[PDB]
Amino acid sequence: VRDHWVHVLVPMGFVFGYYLDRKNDEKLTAFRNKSLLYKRELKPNEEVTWK
Amino acid sequence: WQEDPEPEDENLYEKNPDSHGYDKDPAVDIWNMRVVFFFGFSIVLVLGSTFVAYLPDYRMQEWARREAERLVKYREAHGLPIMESNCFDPSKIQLPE
Amino acid sequence: MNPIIFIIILLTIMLGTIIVMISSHWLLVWIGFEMNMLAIIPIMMKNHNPRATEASTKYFLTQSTASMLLMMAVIINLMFSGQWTVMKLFNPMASMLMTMALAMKLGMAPFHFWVPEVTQGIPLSSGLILLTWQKLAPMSVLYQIFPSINLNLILTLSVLSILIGGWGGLNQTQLRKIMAYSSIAHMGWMTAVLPYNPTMTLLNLIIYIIMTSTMFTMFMANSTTTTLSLSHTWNKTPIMTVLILATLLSMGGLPPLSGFMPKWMIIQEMTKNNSIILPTFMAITALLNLYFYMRLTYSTTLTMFPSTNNMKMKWQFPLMKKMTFLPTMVVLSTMMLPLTPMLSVLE
Amino acid sequence: MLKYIIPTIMLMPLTWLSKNNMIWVNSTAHSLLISFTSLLLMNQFGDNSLNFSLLFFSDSLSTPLLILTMWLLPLMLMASQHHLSKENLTRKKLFITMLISLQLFLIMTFTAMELILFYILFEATLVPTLIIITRWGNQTERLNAGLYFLFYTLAGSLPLLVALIYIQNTVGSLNFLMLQYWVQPVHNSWSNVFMWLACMMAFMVKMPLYGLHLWLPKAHVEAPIAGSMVLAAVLLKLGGYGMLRITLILNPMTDFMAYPFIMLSLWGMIMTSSICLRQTDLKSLIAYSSVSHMALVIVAILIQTPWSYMGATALMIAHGLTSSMLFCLANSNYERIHSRTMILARGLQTLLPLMATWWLLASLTNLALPPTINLIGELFVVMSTFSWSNITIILMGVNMVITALYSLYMLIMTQRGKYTYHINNISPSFTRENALMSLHILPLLLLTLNPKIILGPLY
Amino acid sequence: DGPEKNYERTMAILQIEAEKAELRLKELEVRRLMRARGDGPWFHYPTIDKELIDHSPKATPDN
Amino acid sequence: LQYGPLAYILGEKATKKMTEKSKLITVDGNICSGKSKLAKEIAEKLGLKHFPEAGIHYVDSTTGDGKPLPVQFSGNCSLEKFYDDPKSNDGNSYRLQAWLYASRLLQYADALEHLLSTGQGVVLERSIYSDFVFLEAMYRQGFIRKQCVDHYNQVKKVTICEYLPPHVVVYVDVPVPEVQSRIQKKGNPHEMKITSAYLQDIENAYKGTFLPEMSEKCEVLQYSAWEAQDAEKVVEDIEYLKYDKGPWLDQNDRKLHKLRMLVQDKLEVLNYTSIPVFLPEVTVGAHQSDQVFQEFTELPGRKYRAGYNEDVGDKWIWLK
Amino acid sequence: KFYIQEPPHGSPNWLKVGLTLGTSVFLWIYLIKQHNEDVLEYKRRNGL
Amino acid sequence: RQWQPDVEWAEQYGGAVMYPTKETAHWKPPPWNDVD
Amino acid sequence: ATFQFLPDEARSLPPPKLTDPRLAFVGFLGYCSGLIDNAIRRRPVLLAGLHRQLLYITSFVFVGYYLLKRQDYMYAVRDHDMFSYIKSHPEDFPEKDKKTYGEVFEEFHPVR
Numbered sequence A: 001v002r003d004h005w006v007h008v009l010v011p012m013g014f015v016f017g018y019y020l021d022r023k024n025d026e027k028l029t030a031f032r033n034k035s036l037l038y039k040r041e042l043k044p045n046e047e048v049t050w051k
Numbered sequence B: 001w002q003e004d005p006e007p008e009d010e011n012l013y014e015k016n017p018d019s020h021g022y023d024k025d026p027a028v029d030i031w032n033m034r035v036v037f038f039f040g041f042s043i044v045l046v047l048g049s050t051f052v053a054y055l056p057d058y059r060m061q062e063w064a065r066r067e068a069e070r071l072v073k074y075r076e077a078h079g080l081p082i083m084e085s086n087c088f089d090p091s092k093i094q095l096p097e
Numbered sequence C: 001m002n003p004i005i006f007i008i009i010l011l012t013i014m015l016g017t018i019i020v021m022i023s024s025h026w027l028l029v030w031i032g033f034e035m036n037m038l039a040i041i042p043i044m045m046k047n048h049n050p051r052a053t054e055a056s057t058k059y060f061l062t063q064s065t066a067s068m069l070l071m072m073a074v075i076i077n078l079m080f081s082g083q084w085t086v087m088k089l090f091n092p093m094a095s096m097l098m099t100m101a102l103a104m105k106l107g108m109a110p111f112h113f114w115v116p117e118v119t120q121g122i123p124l125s126s127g128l129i130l131l132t133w134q135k136l137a138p139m140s141v142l143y144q145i146f147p148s149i150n151l152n153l154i155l156t157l158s159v160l161s162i163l164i165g166g167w168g169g170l171n172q173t174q175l176r177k178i179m180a181y182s183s184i185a186h187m188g189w190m191t192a193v194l195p196y197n198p199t200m201t202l203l204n205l206i207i208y209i210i211m212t213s214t215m216f217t218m219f220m221a222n223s224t225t226t227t228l229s230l231s232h233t234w235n236k237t238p239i240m241t242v243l244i245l246a247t248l249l250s251m252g253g254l255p256p257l258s259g260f261m262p263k264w265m266i267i268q269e270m271t272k273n274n275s276i277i278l279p280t281f282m283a284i285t286a287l288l289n290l291y292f293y294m295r296l297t298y299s300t301t302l303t304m305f306p307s308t309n310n311m312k313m314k315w316q317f318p319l320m321k322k323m324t325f326l327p328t329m330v331v332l333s334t335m336m337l338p339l340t341p342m343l344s345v346l347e
Numbered sequence D: 001m002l003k004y005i006i007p008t009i010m011l012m013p014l015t016w017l018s019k020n021n022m023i024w025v026n027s028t029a030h031s032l033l034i035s036f037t038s039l040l041l042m043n044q045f046g047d048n049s050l051n052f053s054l055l056f057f058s059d060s061l062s063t064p065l066l067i068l069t070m071w072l073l074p075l076m077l078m079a080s081q082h083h084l085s086k087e088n089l090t091r092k093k094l095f096i097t098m099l100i101s102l103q104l105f106l107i108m109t110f111t112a113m114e115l116i117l118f119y120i121l122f123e124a125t126l127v128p129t130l131i132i133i134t135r136w137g138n139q140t141e142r143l144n145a146g147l148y149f150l151f152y153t154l155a156g157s158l159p160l161l162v163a164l165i166y167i168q169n170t171v172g173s174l175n176f177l178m179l180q181y182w183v184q185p186v187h188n189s190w191s192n193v194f195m196w197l198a199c200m201m202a203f204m205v206k207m208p209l210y211g212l213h214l215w216l217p218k219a220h221v222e223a224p225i226a227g228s229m230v231l232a233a234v235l236l237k238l239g240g241y242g243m244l245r246i247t248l249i250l251n252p253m254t255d256f257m258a259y260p261f262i263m264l265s266l267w268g269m270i271m272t273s274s275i276c277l278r279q280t281d282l283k284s285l286i287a288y289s290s291v292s293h294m295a296l297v298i299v300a301i302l303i304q305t306p307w308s309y310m311g312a313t314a315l316m317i318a319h320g321l322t323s324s325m326l327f328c329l330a331n332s333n334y335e336r337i338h339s340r341t342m343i344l345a346r347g348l349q350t351l352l353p354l355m356a357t358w359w360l361l362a363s364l365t366n367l368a369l370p371p372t373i374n375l376i377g378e379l380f381v382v383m384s385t386f387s388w389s390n391i392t393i394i395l396m397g398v399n400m401v402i403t404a405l406y407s408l409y410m411l412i413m414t415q416r417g418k419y420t421y422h423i424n425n426i427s428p429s430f431t432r433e434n435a436l437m438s439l440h441i442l443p444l445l446l447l448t449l450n451p452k453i454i455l456g457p458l459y
Numbered sequence E: 001d002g003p004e005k006n007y008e009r010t011m012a013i014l015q016i017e018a019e020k021a022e023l024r025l026k027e028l029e030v031r032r033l034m035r036a037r038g039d040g041p042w043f044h045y046p047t048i049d050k051e052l053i054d055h056s057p058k059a060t061p062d063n
Numbered sequence F: 001l002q003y004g005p006l007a008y009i010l011g012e013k014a015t016k017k018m019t020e021k022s023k024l025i026t027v028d029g030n031i032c033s034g035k036s037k038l039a040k041e042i043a044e045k046l047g048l049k050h051f052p053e054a055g056i057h058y059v060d061s062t063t064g065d066g067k068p069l070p071v072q073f074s075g076n077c078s079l080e081k082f083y084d085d086p087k088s089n090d091g092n093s094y095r096l097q098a099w100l101y102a103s104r105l106l107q108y109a110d111a112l113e114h115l116l117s118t119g120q121g122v123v124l125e126r127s128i129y130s131d132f133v134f135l136e137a138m139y140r141q142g143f144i145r146k147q148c149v150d151h152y153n154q155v156k157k158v159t160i161c162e163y164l165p166p167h168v169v170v171y172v173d174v175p176v177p178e179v180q181s182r183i184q185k186k187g188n189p190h191e192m193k194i195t196s197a198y199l200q201d202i203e204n205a206y207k208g209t210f211l212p213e214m215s216e217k218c219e220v221l222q223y224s225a226w227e228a229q230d231a232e233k234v235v236e237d238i239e240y241l242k243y244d245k246g247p248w249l250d251q252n253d254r255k256l257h258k259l260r261m262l263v264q265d266k267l268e269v270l271n272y273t274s275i276p277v278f279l280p281e282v283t284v285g286a287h288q289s290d291q292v293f294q295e296f297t298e299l300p301g302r303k304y305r306a307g308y309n310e311d312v313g314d315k316w317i318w319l320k
Numbered sequence G: 001k002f003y004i005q006e007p008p009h010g011s012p013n014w015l016k017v018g019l020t021l022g023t024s025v026f027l028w029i030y031l032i033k034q035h036n037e038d039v040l041e042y043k044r045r046n047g048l
Numbered sequence H: 001r002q003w004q005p006d007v008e009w010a011e012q013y014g015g016a017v018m019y020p021t022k023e024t025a026h027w028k029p030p031p032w033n034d035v036d
Numbered sequence I: 001a002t003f004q005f006l007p008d009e010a011r012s013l014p015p016p017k018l019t020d021p022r023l024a025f026v027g028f029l030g031y032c033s034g035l036i037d038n039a040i041r042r043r044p045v046l047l048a049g050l051h052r053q054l055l056y057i058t059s060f061v062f063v064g065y066y067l068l069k070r071q072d073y074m075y076a077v078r079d080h081d082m083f084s085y086i087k088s089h090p091e092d093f094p095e096k097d098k099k100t101y102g103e104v105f106e107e108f109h110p111v112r
């Protein structure tokens, strides 16, 4: 609707920002499953510990 | 000089005795009342308070109590001191001189 | 002026500058300055009034005296090294003369007296050339001879310019005099960092040129030359007041605007060299500039000054001046701080 | 933090693309949704801070300040829309844009890891704040108030810029996580005395420190209501937040460098509280009350103990909601009688019964009635300064007596006694005004049931 | 976010920031030595090019 | 192309279009002197463009849709109010005169732009060269303050110096009692309140100051009421003028290019008509100025630059 | 004809519109073509 | 209403200089069109 | 090279992505210039001259792309120079022997 389309801007900004925050984590995986504290063996079908 | 006179102050209740104080347009005035009350009170304060009440162990305060109980049980069972003055093992330290 | 002659004279101004920047021979550098001065006088004289004649005369005497001192430095250098290559000089006395000659050309204090008067006496479009393009040639020489420059002399010229430029602008109501004293203060920052990192001189120079060109263009768009004339802009072109506001705050070095970047990068370079008192003094003294920029914002944008009845006639006619590159320049004048690392392109 | 930065930016096209009469409805509604999502920052761990990326991070200190920042924007919009009713539409939108841009700078300021990034955004808050005061203030003096505000801040911030750049060259980084591990002790020398001052004086002017405070009463008397709310609720806390962070790298020199500033704050709080008893301007009284409260914060930050850092964090949050509420209460009278004089309109409880209850609740939190978070913060600071030196209890005790006196005196003078006979335009309270007051006090009093979330990293 | 993701995300942040700090300190040291000794690519101020010299026999022999 | 240096470089030169009939002619006289009729006949006979006397709404007629705007956008200047209350405290008298000078200044630029752009001459009824006679008459009757005269001369000094004077000045000398008799015959209620002393001051200003001055640089033709009726004789005299005076003889393509660059830019034409000389009659305070400007932007086809107003039927905005 | 005088921008300057779109199209083609050649030369020099 | 500059306030910025002194008392604003 | 914007050696470096966040910002700046162009000339700010607005973005992106390439090349050159100098002067950059905190002595300053 042309009357109420402005009401998606801020919610879409939040989704886009949530999206960009998660991709930013993907550039910081140098130590995923490599810390002395949390290092372990991968679960039988697990590809990564977190993402 | 060539200056407009100062306008008299407008009482929003004169034209709209039901005014909520938000806008001179009655329909907008009512909508602006509803968003403030719904998003302010119904959502942020009620759901936000509920969210805060059920935060999962804010700053592991509960875990530390469970962990302390586990250590106290183990150390008393084995006759160890409950807590030691030295935080770090002196065998890993090398004093000067 | 005939439009074809005006273009030819403008290209001669540019060619004189270019010769200075591409020459490896001191004689050709001197020729570039001579050519540039020859072609700049007609554009200062182009409205034929006594004030324009006075400005051109005062400009001619100052630049001619400086070019004589430049040639004297070149010949002393020839006596003591037997060569003409444009680079460090091989005699301390030649270095002082060349440095003073170039300070005279740039209008740095205490050789600054001509800049406010010449700028006031020439049209806005001529003042735009005087305070922007004309800095390129002397700065490009300073960029090449700085290893032989006496450190005490260059920093003294820088400190005095920041002080004189800051104090001089406080007493001004004429827009061209305000810009002139703004220029003197900004040349001071450019030369303070020259001994340490010439790249930051270029960065400060380029950013200064962009903001100064923005201000002069906006003054031309409304034909404003006084503070009170500029205070009418709100009742004609409200958008222009917002652009003037942002540009002035940028020229004041306020974050997060582009004009913060050169002051910020210069402070960094001098601190790396264990120079703490000088950057601190310069930054504090630069608040003098921020004060009389803020004053302009008060009368132009943040308050509505009284108008006149005849202004209503102006409401009916569109703005027909070219205002070339203003939308681009104003955006670069204000919004470049997130791109600061791009200063390495100048390295 | 992008999940908050981007939606905050989207409030700008939302305002500019809204229908002409829906600018207040749309911006208020969506800035409340942003405020709602800000509670996701409560994912705070006991050992590690929440480190999102190379640029931004949250811990228990910045999180409550971030939530206060994002909650204040919708409140500032309701507070402002009445006195801006005759403004032309484009200038209303520009006003809202200045508020949105101020929130954008604030949430970035509180989450920046790197201290130069903090400095730039910390400085960027000056521009919109100055514009709001000087453009949309009411009286002639707003131009001077803008100048005092600008130059007090810059006189302090420019030396800070030099010191921070110096620190990075020596240490190699200004990332706050790195500074936690690479920090080295500050040894005695005249060089380090001035490094200490350059690192602190900018934040002291913001608090403001007693003796550097005279800009604050001018700014408040001249600013519009939204300007006062952001100034009192959040902008003063930039100084507190900056000091809480930068004191990490100033040890042990703070042990003796703090003394002149503890004496100013300990004595300053008594003098500003006593000044409040004689103020004639209601906005000026509240401004002096803020100086008195922030004096405790400075003392708590300077003595550097776990209890004082918890007290400082709680006081900063409690003061923000209380002082912002008091300005809104004072403004609602002003929008009726168009004067800030406290003695002009009296006996207002007789004419506005419910609004008098908001006055009572606001005053009770200002004098720190147990168990409000205002008292929790003040009590924690009083406990820690007692260990610092037992004698301070006398200064703290006297201030608590005087604070109750001017808090109730303000309530008694304006709400009790006989109503002014000739003032006959005291119309009933609007729903907007009552909702505005209750959106301050209700979150404030709800926090009493769960104080830990405002006690900061030392909890 | 779980505590392991934040914990190991912090390590990645620390590694980058720590490496940048070390490189910043080296650059200050490298710049100091290059400027004092002129034996590096930086602070290399020009000298006259020797390919400009005429090596042919001159009009007179002593040169 | 829109006129400018590029068009000039490509041949658009004033001398290639101006002929021997490219003359600027102005008709002057006292009130109710039949100058409007004589001016209309000269233009018809000579094939020149006729410009009616520039009134309060002259600028309205050249912009937008051409229709007069409400009076608030003219500053409430009223010629009718001037006759009824010439000494009113709202400063209507000088505000009208300052407004009228600006309207004439705009009209003179429109006239010169027409002449330089097409080579066709124009006929005006009074001009910025003769507008001062009303100012002097107003001052001598005590209708305006001395400071008003100083402001008028300041504005006139920095505007008239840019423009060339008329080629021909046609003065129609009707004695004051005859004019005073014709005003009554014309049956205008407010105009009938004029006094002979005011009319005599107007006449004195022409003969004392205007005509002697214009003779130094223009061809001045004078006539009586009877001699004026013979339009053919007047046009016969004009066609037999020598043209050996005035600055028009020193003009060339170069100088006329600069003149055409000025007169085509109306904002540059009016630049100095609103100098910040805070005089009560012409000074408007910020609040009134602000809201009147806002009302102006709401008039049909006035929010945006001409050609970008959808509310008046402009099309292709997304490509203009 | 609402306007008493023909506006300068009454009708779009079709040539200039064609030039504007042509320049934008050319620049985008040049950029993508440049970027692709940069990628290929980058991989040839590093043997990817 | 919000205060806006009046004529007296505007005239502070209309002089030859901002800070009058005995030495500049004879200075006058330059011509509007720069022509003398 | 001398007086070369992007010397030939710069082609070894990966090109900036067309989705570079800095390049998007430059594109945004170009968009803003387009709006300010409409505003100063009193055109409808959002709708007027879409052809003109398209070239503002394209122009900024095109120029911004090459400035980004030179920027990245100059920092790569800076790192390349610095590492070579460190390699060629190992005596000025010795690998110091690091000690652990158990070994190193740091004064304690009580906060009381």
Ligand SMILES: CCCCCCCCCCCCCCCCCC(=O)OC[C@H](COP(=O)(O)OCCN)OC(=O)CCCCCCCCCCCCCCCCC
Pocket (backbone or CB within 6 Å): C237, C238, C239, C240, C241, C242, C243, C245, C246, C249, C256, C257, C301, C302, C330, C331, C334, C335, C336, C337, C338, D090, D091, D094, D101, D127, D128, D131, D135, I039
């Ligand atoms: C992103 C990284 C970079 C970060 C640095 C910050 C960049 C921002 C600075 C960008 C450069 C400035 C350009 C700002 C655009 C302003 C355009 C605008 O908002 O509208 C102006 C408004 C419209 O006026 P007009 O169009 O003529 O007529 C209105 C009828 N509808 O005109 C008016 O109505 C006049 C209103 C009165 C004047 C009010 C002045 C206060 C508001 C000023 C806001 C801009 C301040 C810029 C400073 C930076 C802010 C952080």
Ligand SMILES: CCCCCCCCCCCCO[C@@H]1O[C@H](CO)[C@@H](O[C@H]2O[C@H](CO)[C@@H](O)[C@H](O)[C@H]2O)[C@H](O)[C@H]1O
Pocket (backbone or CB within 6 Å): C076, C091, C092, C093
């Ligand atoms: C504005 C005033 C302009 C007046 C210009 C007057 C002409 C100036 C002529 C300068 C030429 C002589 O310049 C001077 O010559 C002597 C002769 O070796 C140099 O030599 C002198 O200084 C250096 C110092 O280490 C050594 O060479 C030596 O110890 C000493 O004799 C000076 O370093 C040089 O500065």
Ligand SMILES: CCCCCCCCCCCCO[C@@H]1O[C@H](CO)[C@@H](O[C@H]2O[C@H](CO)[C@@H](O)[C@H](O)[C@H]2O)[C@H](O)[C@H]1O
Pocket (backbone or CB within 6 Å): D016, D017, D018, D019, D020, I044, I046, I047, I050, I051, I053, I054, I055, I057
């Ligand atoms: C080359 C890349 C260019 C990218 C451009 C992307 C956006 C382009 C938008 C083009 C269409 C804009 O079209 C224009 O929008 C605004 C608001 O949206 C409308 O005008 C508006 O006025 C006011 C607000 O100021 C409100 O009543 C309402 O928002 C709307 O009516 C215009 O009626 C419409 O003509």
Ligand SMILES: Nc1nc2c(ncn2[C@@H]2O[C@H](COP(=O)(O)OP(=O)(O)OP(=O)(O)O)[C@@H](O)[C@H]2O)c(=O)[nH]1
Pocket (backbone or CB within 6 Å): F029, F030, F031, F032, F033, F034, F035, F036, F037, F053, F079, F082, F096, F097, F100, F131, F134, F191
């Ligand atoms: N105050 C003032 N009145 C003016 C001015 N120009 C014209 N008027 C008045 O406009 C009215 C009509 O103008 P006139 O042309 O002189 O009289 P007319 O009868 O309509 O025209 P003719 O008889 O043909 O000459 C007169 O009352 C004039 O006084 C002016 O510059 N100032």
Ligand SMILES: N=C(N)NC(=N)NCCc1ccc(I)c(Cl)c1
Pocket (backbone or CB within 6 Å): C196, C197, C198, C199, C344, C347, E031, E042, E043, I074, I075, I077, I078
């Ligand atoms: N003279 C100075 N101190 N400054 C200076 N230009 N130093 C040269 C060091 C340097 C810095 C950045 C880059 I990128 C590059 Cl390639 C080289």
Ligand SMILES: [Mg+2]
Pocket (backbone or CB within 6 Å): F035, F036, F053
């Ligand atoms: Mg007539």
